[PDB]
RNA sequence: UAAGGAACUCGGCAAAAUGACCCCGUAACUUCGGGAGAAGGGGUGCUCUUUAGGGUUAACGCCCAGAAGAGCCGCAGUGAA
RNA sequence: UGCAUUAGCUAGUUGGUAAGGUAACGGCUUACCAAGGCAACGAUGCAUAGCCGACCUGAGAGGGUGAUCGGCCACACUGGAACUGAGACACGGUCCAGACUCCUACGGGAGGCAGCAGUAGGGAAUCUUCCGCAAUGGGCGAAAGCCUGACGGAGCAACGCCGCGUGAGUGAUGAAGGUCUUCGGAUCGUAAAACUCUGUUAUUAGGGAAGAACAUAUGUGUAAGUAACUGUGCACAUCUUGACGGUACCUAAUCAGAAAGCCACGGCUAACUACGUGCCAGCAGCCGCGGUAAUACGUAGGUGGCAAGCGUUAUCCGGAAUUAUUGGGCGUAAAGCGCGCGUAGGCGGUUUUUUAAGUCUGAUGUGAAAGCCCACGGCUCAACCGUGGAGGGUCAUUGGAAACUGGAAAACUUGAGUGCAGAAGAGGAAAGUGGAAUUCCAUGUGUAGCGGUGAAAUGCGCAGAGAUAUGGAGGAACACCAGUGGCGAAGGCGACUUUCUGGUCUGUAACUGACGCUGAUGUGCGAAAGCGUGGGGAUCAAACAGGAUUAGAUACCCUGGUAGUCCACGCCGUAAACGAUGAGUGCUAAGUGUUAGGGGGUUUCCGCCCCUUAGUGCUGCAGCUAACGCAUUAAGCACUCCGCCUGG
RNA sequence: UAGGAGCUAGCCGUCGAAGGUGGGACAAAUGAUUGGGGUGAAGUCGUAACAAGGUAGCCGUAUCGGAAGGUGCGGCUGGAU
């Protein structure tokens, strides 16, 4: 350009969408408007329970949740692990972190954490999945 | 409607310097021929000469090279212009490439150079990083 | 005609309510004409100053006012129709 | 801070004229005067947000956080009004009004946790209804005293920073031991039982500490001294008290005591192998593993990365020059409207002289506290706090210098305009001359087919259908001169004769002394089709029709035929309006035709060769790009302006 | 006396927060039903485009067809003879 026109319009930055909308939002209960406060996890509750095809190649049946958050947005969150207590109305933690391969789905669902408890019969992933550490 | 005389005029140089010339040219001022002085006073040219004609005379350049039908004047540029006039401090004044290049200094103390304004304590307006 | 106000009744039928003039304001929609007096607000007697209008202008005087101030009376001032 | 998908903003407003009254000012209000003043440099309004220091990462160009930690502003259920006070329109004052809450013997009474804990709520979550004022610091009092929910400490939390740990010389490379075996084995593994030894921490039983020094308390006095002396500032040296706390610390005794966890072992990337397992369970940062032989899943030994963490999740920065001043592109990738012309704006040829404004320097003051240069001191290291200049080398108080810019005075003409001599035409709006054709009506003419068909047929034929010519007409244009010809900004421009002109170009270059370019606004044109009028339906022709083909129709075949067509009369505002290249100026290999003007040599019986200008074209260096391809009618080498672009 | 002046009180009109509606404007939420879009499965039919993809494209435009496509008029090559 010119440094002339740059003065008259200048070098404006570009804006990153960022990924996860749904956890960089609150909810002003008293007014139900919407704050923005970007939490790590906010806990939520589940409505329904059920399973996804991957659309790629890659067969396998992988475990969805639709959770309502705090601030009542709906949700389709992955479930990892293999046995879970999230028949339904679970009161549940939710992460972020997206789950490829699988389309509208890019939630995770915390295990062990606010109303499950995490899968049983781990002993290399034994951290993660709600397993205290033997002995 | 051409408004950086010292850069066509220097880019004319590099025009024919690529074609390897040896005799060229360039109209004149007060300044463009003590500017072109300025070249001859570092002698990187064999002499640039004489303003002959009625309204900015043709002073002319003789380029000289090296041996090994090189040439001399490697880079060849006025950083300043009609819409930014650019300024250098005394302090820290820099060196093109690193030693081997010359860059002049224009104020009212006479148009000076990298050598005739380091040990002047003057800055100015710069022009050429020419190495 | 107390209180109530369509509970009447097939149905607000009948009645009640609105109404003149002046000033402010006025939607959707439209064939751009309209809708429109949309809706909705406010004012109005008498006396004295007056600066001044329509001027009765000759000018205030001759009546309405130019319409502004200051007053007076009544439950109520297009006090009826 | 951002939005013109906010442009016209204000009317005590805008200036002044007089009273206030303020610690002072006035449109601050009130009577007067003109509509003025404010504006696209985006006033106005909207939306969002206490500001700064500071943090933080960036090579620098710097810009994002504010819990921090300091300085300033605003607030104290809400909204008004005042009082008092030096200072308030007052966080634990008053009144009014409102909304909520509470006590009641029902008569009326009350309350405002954003002072510190605590409670509920919401949240993923963020401290004990803690101690003591010993220190400091403040309040009124000489002082003593009270208030400290300031402050100084304790609690609790790995949430985070620094040390401390989870402790050793041996001795079987096989003592007892399995993620393997074409087991024989090295092996977990100088691991380890079985021992030398040390006691960080730890167990636990005894000294103990600074801080904790500074007063007023404890007279002689001095200084202003005083009628004399307490008093007050000033020397003692006599004596005061300590939350933390007998906590920290020191001694000894003590056992080698009681202590690391986690993700992969596919390629990125150092850490592999067996059981299931059968695209299933499931992993999944990108590429991907599992279909009965998975190193990748899930199951288990090794190691590995490094330690009280490891891993996940979300959030700002570097990596990244995908905002490219530094340090980006606009021919085919995303980046030129369809072209203009043009208002503002930006940016402008050439050569002299003034200022010192801008430039660049020199005398100082000189830029901020944790943050920030360099070197010490304090911390057991350190975590964490001070020192010494550096100190600003950025801003101000100060002196200056004119090439180059700002203003001041001149010129030159290339560049542009006004001159002069001529060339050409399809350049727009108006009048004539004639040709040829499809359609019609008529003559002559005649009678069986004429038209249409890839294949035939519909049709048109007995009226003479067409035919056929001296000759009758209509609709509408006008092959030939016709071209990598010319003109027009572009859409474009075509038989011509004439009218009015545009404009191109050359040559001489006479003159004005750069009179320019972009070009936001604005104004035009704006191709075709479509909204409609009058000539239009002659031909053509959407829509519609007919005949068959074809395996399939009415499709490829065919005509008839409607508006629409043609033109004039209104536009709409769109095209691959593309040279897929915005516009103006300098410079770097060529050859080759051709359009107009000037230049000639021979001459030619109007033709050969050649200079130049402006161009029209075709090939083709260096440079260029990703390459195509461009290269004097640049996408090469430089300058100025506008506009546009940054994943689909 | 407390009569004047003042003051408490008394009236009398200027400006008021809030309120009260009043009309709207603006914003958000919800709404029986709906209609465009995305993802999956493409379950289904056709084969349009890419081979002069069996009857070259492309833009502006216009019309029909549910759509694909059909045609027509100007312009462009980013096409075979």
Same mark, same amino acid.
Request: proline share 5%; hydrophobic share 35%; aromatic share 4%.
């Given at each position: 350009?010119?440094?002339?026109?740059?003065?008259?319009?200048?070098?404006? @930055?570009? *804006?990153?969408?960022?990924? @996860?909308?749904?956890?960089?939002?609150?909810?002003?209960?008293?007014?139900?408007?919407?704050?923005?406060?970007?939490?790590?996890?906010?806990?939520?509750?589940?409505?329904?329970?059920?399973?996804?095809?991957?659309?790629?190649?890659?067969?396998?049946?992988?475990?969805?949740?639709?959770?309502?958050? @705090?601030?009542?947005?709906?949700?389709?969150?992955?479930?990892?692990? *293999?046995?879970?207590?999230?028949?339904?109305? @679970?009161?549940?933690?939710?992460?972020?972190?997206?789950?490829?391969?699988?389309?509208?789905?890019?939630?995770? *669902?915390?295990?062990?954490?606010?109303?499950?408890?995490?899968?049983?019969?781990?002993?290399?992933?034994?951290?993660?999945?709600?397993?205290?550490?033997?002995? | 409607?051409?408004?950086? !005389?010292?850069?066509?005029?220097?880019?004319?140089? /590099?025009?024919?310097?690529? &074609?390897?010339?040896?005799?060229?040219?360039? !109209?004149?001022?007060?300044?463009?021929?003590? $500017?072109?002085?300025?070249?001859?006073?570092?002698?990187? $040219?064999?002499?640039?000469?004489? &303003?002959?004609? +009625?309204?900015?005379?043709?002073?002319?350049?003789?380029?000289?090279?090296?041996?090994?039908?090189?040439?001399? $004047?490697?880079?060849?540029?006025?950083?300043?212009?009609?819409?930014?006039? =650019?300024?250098?401090?005394?302090?820290?004044? !820099?060196? =093109?490439?690193?030693?081997?290049?010359?860059?002049?200094?224009?104020?009212?103390?006479? &148009?000076?150079? +990298?050598?005739?304004? /380091?040990?002047?304590? &003057?800055?100015?307006? $710069?022009?050429?990083? =020419?190495?």
């Amino acid at each position: 350009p010119t440094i002339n026109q740059l003065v008259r319009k200048p070098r404006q @930055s570009k *804006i990153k969408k960022s990924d @996860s909308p749904a956890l960089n939002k609150g909810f002003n209960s008293k007014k139900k408007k919407f704050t923005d406060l970007n939490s790590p996890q906010k806990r939520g509750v589940c409505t329904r329970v059920g399973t996804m095809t991957p659309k790629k190649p890659n067969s396998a049946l992988r475990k969805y949740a639709r959770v309502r958050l @705090s601030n009542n947005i709906e949700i389709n969150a992955y479930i990892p692990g *293999i046995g879970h207590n999230l028949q339904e109305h @679970s009161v549940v933690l939710v992460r972020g972190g997206r789950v490829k391969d699988l389309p509208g789905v890019r939630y995770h *669902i915390v295990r062990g954490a606010l109303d499950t408890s995490g899968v049983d019969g781990r002993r290399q992933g034994r951290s993660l999945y709600g397993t205290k550490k033997p002995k | 409607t051409m408004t950086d !005389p010292i850069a066509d005029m220097l880019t004319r140089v /590099r025009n024919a310097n690529m &074609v390897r010339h040896e005799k060229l040219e360039l !109209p004149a001022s007060n300044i463009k021929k003590e $500017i072109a002085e300025i070249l001859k006073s570092e002698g990187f $040219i064999k002499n640039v000469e004489y &303003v002959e004609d +009625d309204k900015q005379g043709v002073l002319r350049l003789f380029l000289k090279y090296g041996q090994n039908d090189e040439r001399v $004047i490697t880079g060849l540029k006025r950083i300043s212009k009609p819409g930014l006039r =650019v300024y250098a401090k005394a302090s820290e004044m !820099p060196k =093109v490439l690193n030693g081997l290049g010359i860059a002049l200094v224009s104020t009212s103390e006479g &148009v000076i150079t +990298d050598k005739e304004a /380091r040990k002047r304590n &003057v800055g100015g307006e $710069i022009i050429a990083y =020419v190495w």
